[PDB]
């Protein structure tokens, strides 16, 4: 005969404490397990709102196991292995509500024994345990968000300048990534932004489009309600030459003596490249980026890139005027301070 079944259990969090609402820990809505005989799909079985798929019918022999979650309307039935391995995704408005956050594990070469096979059952149940440990799948997206924005004007600007936030933006967000691979960055060269495509900055990429869902009306960030965006992988770690760093930005009016900028004050702040024509200023933060006014908690080293399954939480302290071009090299004036906490998400059980 050679008929077999396989059952796959995912690694979920062993948490003894509830997770805070602002953390957006990963949840599985749909889970798909595929079993490949060479290139052809031999089995494909989904569960909804579950962290395991059981009793998948297949046959004895060497196979490739592929596991994907939260793939929504993506068509997986009948895809070849090479087709599934080369799948891509693009950033969506849906991702900004933490929906459509695809999770994958790397494809795994296994041998099915006739009868029952298990992955993630820690030796429990009769049959062949290909792997004892529950299988780890990870989000392909990352999140950049403010958890705090505070204005503490330094001595030159205190009791003179104030800042009235209006928008929070995601800039230079790479449009596409792969879903499998040691890295998910790929060669597609398209980028998205919630602000202008016209800044013509040192960071501005040639292929660039505005989308309304990378911009938010300003809401005072809180730990329970981080303010930011989901993004895909993007590498800006080059030693030199042009880089395209993903940026989280706050934008608003720079007022002086309690009033909108006018006259000589406006002209001076415009000439200083602090404010644009409407007296408004930008405070950009290059995410996961090594800069001297960025501090990272607990001796983490920024890698100058967006990595999947990472939460980049930013505390921003504003101490002077900002910039009128948020896409120009990490500003010469340290009129802001960043403290960033970085973490990886886990999968919470059902």
Curated annotation (Swiss-Prot):
Entry keyword Signal: yes
Q: Does the keyword Magnesium apply?
A: no
Grouped into one coarse class, the protein's main location is: other
GO cellular component terms? cell outer membrane; pilus
A biological process (GO) of this protein is:
cell adhesion
Please give the knockout or disruption phenotype noted for this protein. FimA-deficient cells lack major fimbriae, resulting in strongly decreased adherence to host cells. Double mutants lacking both FimA and Mfa1 lack major and minor fimbriae; they fail to adhere to host cells.
PTM summary from the entry reads:
Synthesized as palmitoylated precursor. Efficient export to the outer membrane and integration into fimbriae requires lipidation and subsequent proteolytic removal of the lipidated propeptide.
InterPro entries per the UniProt record, alphabetical: FimA_C, FimA_N, Fimbrillin
Residues with site note (Cleavage): 17-18
Tell me, what does this protein do in biology?
Answer: Structural subunit of the major fimbriae. These long, filamentous pili are attached to the cell surface; they mediate biofilm formation, adhesion onto host cells and onto other bacteria that are part of the oral microbiome. They play an important role in the invasion of periodontal tissues. Fimbriae and their constituents are major virulence factors. FimA proteins from different strains have highly divergent sequences, and this has been used for classification. The sequence-based classification correlates with pathogenicity.
Similarity comment text for this entry:
Belongs to the bacteroidetes fimbrillin superfamily. FimA/Mfa1 family.
What further note is attached to this protein's record?
A: In some prokaryotes, a valine codon can be used as start of translation. The Val-8 codon had been proposed to serve as start of translation for FimA, but mutagenesis of Val-8 to Ala has no effect on FimA biosynthesis.
Known partners and oligomeric status: Fimbriae are composed of a major, structural subunit (FimA) and the minor components FimC, FimD and FimE. Head-to-tail oligomerization of FimA molecules mediates assembly of the fimbrium stalk, while the minor components probably form the fimbrium tip. Linear, head-to-tail oligomerization of FimA is mediated by a conformation change, facilitating the insertion of a C-terminal beta-strand into a groove in the N-terminal domain of the following subunit. The anchoring subunit FimB limits fimbrium length and is important for solid fimbrium attachment to the outer membrane.
Name of this chain's protein: Major fimbrium subunit FimA type-1
Q: Which organism is it from?
A: Porphyromonas gingivalis (strain ATCC 33277 / DSM 20709 / CIP 103683 / JCM 12257 / NCTC 11834 / 2561)
Q: What is the lineage of its organism?
A: Bacteria, Pseudomonadati, Bacteroidota, Bacteroidia, Bacteroidales
Q: Which gene encodes it?
A: fimA
